[PDB]
Amino acid sequence: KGCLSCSKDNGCSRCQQKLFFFLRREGMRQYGECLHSCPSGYYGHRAPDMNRCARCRIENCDSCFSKDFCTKCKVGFYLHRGRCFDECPAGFAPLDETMEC
């Protein structure tokens, strides 16, 4: 596994000092393991005790940077500052053929 404790029924309970801790639940069982980076649609949140890979809440966001700042928006919306807008205001490039504003 990635972490150290890693009980064979509960997953890796307490991760290391520089890796994240993501709770992967499929079917019924829920377990977690050390990850170097948040997989997708999550944002890392380091802490002096336990690094938690939390879940994004900004809509139309496929990969975020914080709880409010979105890095890569959905394939149907372009991003202006950190949001995922459908309307690009004036004074900015419409899409630049790369889904931006």
User: How is residue 30 written in tokens?
Assistant: 């829920």
- The sign of the dihedral angle between the CA atoms of 95, 98, 99, 101 is negative
Q: Which is nearer to another protein, 14 or 46 (CB)?
A: 46
82 binds another protein (CB under 8 A): yes
Closest CA to 32 of 65, 55, 49, 9: 9
Name which position in 10, 30, 37, 40 contacts another protein (CB under 8 A): 37
Looking at 3-11, 23-31, 61-69, 89-97, which segment touches another protein (CB under 8 A)? 61-69
Alpha-carbon dihedral angle through residues 45, 52, 59, 79, given to the nearest 10 degrees: 30
| Per CB under 8 A, 66 contacts another protein | yes
- Using CB under 8 A, list all residues that contact another protein: 18-19, 36-37, 44, 46-48, 65-66, 68-69, 71, 81-82
